[PDB]
Amino acid sequence: QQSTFLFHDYETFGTHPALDRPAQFAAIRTDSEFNVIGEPEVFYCKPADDYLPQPGAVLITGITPQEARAKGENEAAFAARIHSLFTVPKTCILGYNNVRFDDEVTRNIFYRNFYDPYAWSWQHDNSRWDLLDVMRACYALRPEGINWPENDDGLPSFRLEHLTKANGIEHDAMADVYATIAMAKLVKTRQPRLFDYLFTHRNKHKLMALIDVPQMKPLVHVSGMFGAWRGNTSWVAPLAWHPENRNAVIMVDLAGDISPLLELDSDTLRERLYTAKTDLGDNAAVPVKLVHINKCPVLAQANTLRPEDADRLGINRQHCLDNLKILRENPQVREKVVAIFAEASDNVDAQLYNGFFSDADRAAMKIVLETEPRNLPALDITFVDKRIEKLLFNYRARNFPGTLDYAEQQRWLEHRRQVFTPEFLQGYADELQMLVQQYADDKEKVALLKALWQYAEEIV
DNA sequence: TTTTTTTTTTTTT
Ligand SMILES: [Mg+2]
Numbered sequence A: 001q002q003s004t005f006l007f008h009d010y011e012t013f014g015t016h017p018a019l020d021r022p023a024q025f026a027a028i029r030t031d032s033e034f035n036v037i038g039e040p041e042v043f044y045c046k047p048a049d050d051y052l053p054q055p056g057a058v059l060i061t062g063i064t065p066q067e068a069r070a071k072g073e074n075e076a077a078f079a080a081r082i083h084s085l086f087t088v089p090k091t092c093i094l095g096y097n098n099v100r101f102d103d104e105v106t107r108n109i110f111y112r113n114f115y116d117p118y119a120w121s122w123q124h125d126n127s128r129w130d131l132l133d134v135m136r137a138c139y140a141l142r143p144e145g146i147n148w149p150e151n152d153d154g155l156p157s158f159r160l161e162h163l164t165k166a167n168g169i170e171h172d173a174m175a176d177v178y179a180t181i182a183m184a185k186l187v188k189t190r191q192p193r194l195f196d197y198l199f200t201h202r203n204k205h206k207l208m209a210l211i212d213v214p215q216m217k218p219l220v221h222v223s224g225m226f227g228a229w230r231g232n233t234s235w236v237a238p239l240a241w242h243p244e245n246r247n248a249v250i251m252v253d254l255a256g257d258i259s260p261l262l263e264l265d266s267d268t269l270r271e272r273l274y275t276a277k278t279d280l281g282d283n284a285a286v287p288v289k290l291v292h293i294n295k296c297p298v299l300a301q302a303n304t305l306r307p308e309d310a311d312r313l314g315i316n317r318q319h320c321l322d323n324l325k326i327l328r329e330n331p332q333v334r335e336k337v338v339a340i341f342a343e344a345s346d347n348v349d350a351q352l353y354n355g356f357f358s359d360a361d362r363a364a365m366k367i368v369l370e371t372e373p374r375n376l377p378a379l380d381i382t383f384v385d386k387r388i389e390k391l392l393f394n395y396r397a398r399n400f401p402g403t404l405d406y407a408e409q410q411r412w413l414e415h416r417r418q419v420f421t422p423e424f425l426q427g428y429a430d431e432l433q434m435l436v437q438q439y440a441d442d443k444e445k446v447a448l449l450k451a452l453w454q455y456a457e458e459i460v
Numbered sequence B: 001t002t003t004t005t006t007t008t009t010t011t012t013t
Helices: A055-061 A065-071 A075-086 A102-112 A132-141 A160-165 A173-190 A192-200 A204-208 A259-263 A266-273 A307-313 A317-328 A332-340 A359-370 A373-378 A387-399 A406-419 A422-438 A443-459
Strands: A004-012 A022-031 A041-044 A091-095 A127-130 A219-222 A233-241 A248-253 A288-292 A298-301
Touching: A004 A055, A004 A102, A004 A173, A022 A065, A022 A075, A022 A173, A041 A065, A041 A075, A055 A422, A055 A443, A065 A443, A075 A091, A075 A102, A075 A387, A091 A173, A102 A387, A127 A132, A132 A173, A132 A192, A132 A219, A132 A298, A132 A307, A160 A173, A173 A192, A233 A288, A233 A317, A233 A332, A248 A332, A259 A266, A259 A332, A266 A332, A359 A387, A373 A387, A387 A406, A422 A443
Parallel strands: A004 A091, A091 A127
Antiparallel strands: A004 A022, A022 A041, A219 A233, A219 A298, A233 A248, A248 A288
């Protein structure tokens, strides 16, 4: 049984992993060294008739719902192809921004179509990765050997195509699958030691081994939330485990200003923390970040950021060191910072994270999954979690409408009307109109916009 | 195994 990597990319009909719908899936299996060892896997998803794609998405992809309808299968079947692949044992599933995008799409796809939302990321020696912060880490800590591209600002960029184009390699789902593989090869070759460190430290216990909460042991963290002006980097001190989020540890940015932490109380810090930057004043921002141990965060030994590297990124070493001393010498801050986080929708599509399912409920859902579509009306199952009845109804109506009775068909009509209100339909047309006037002399973009209008006429 | 819709930021469609 061989360890593989499954590189994958989704095209979608919008940015929202729960509310929007997938259009296309692309994947290829490689060996540990990133040599291709299987056929390309590309296929489309038919959108159910309770949905209209966002115009912006479709303009970027070039994939129309008509195209997807013609070329694809229903979501249930789409979910089932994606799942067989994903649950091949000893598979590491990865892409480019997948942890914060594609993996969300996957969780919701399995959630909607009765597969476990997470098991593909851990069962049977499975795992996941994401090359995005690998690229960021490399630039920040061992930039040598790779060309780092900039914007009209001078800031380093990490858009995939910007990176591949800058390194003489090369929208199209399968093309992005190759670009990701190519990017994995590049770093592996130019910086194997860092690559090894980041691969090994995906592990949460490996990460906990690095996290010393009681002593506030300083670390280097790379993250987009720091922004390209610092090359996404800073030194960090772990203060506490998040009181409500098992996968989060509360951390202080040692480069920021630690006086609002020293001075304000917990309630004022909380209020300060949740004020936007624009409607923030002459006041300092609270320099606290959550780091999520399950999301392949880049966390290394403090001294991994080399003096010259810190100097390149313009990160004040002594300032950090000063803050770390103060924080260690003011234990009460920890009490306040934790208290910040100890405070705490009718669409079932949006309620995946409401919680796990009981044991009765998972066995029942298992049976939903194993039943031929045609046989579900004959089932009559009882669930406890109120999500499931709704999950089931959407599942059946969206994927197997030939299967619904009149009551169910009436319920579905109602549902469609509640989605396609006149106010929603007005909003959709306005956007299309607005867009057709912006790209009036673009034969490609005008024809997409037009196909989107027709599709709305034809399904609503 | 997980964090949904207050903040940071940048990328994903
Ligand atoms: Mg992508």
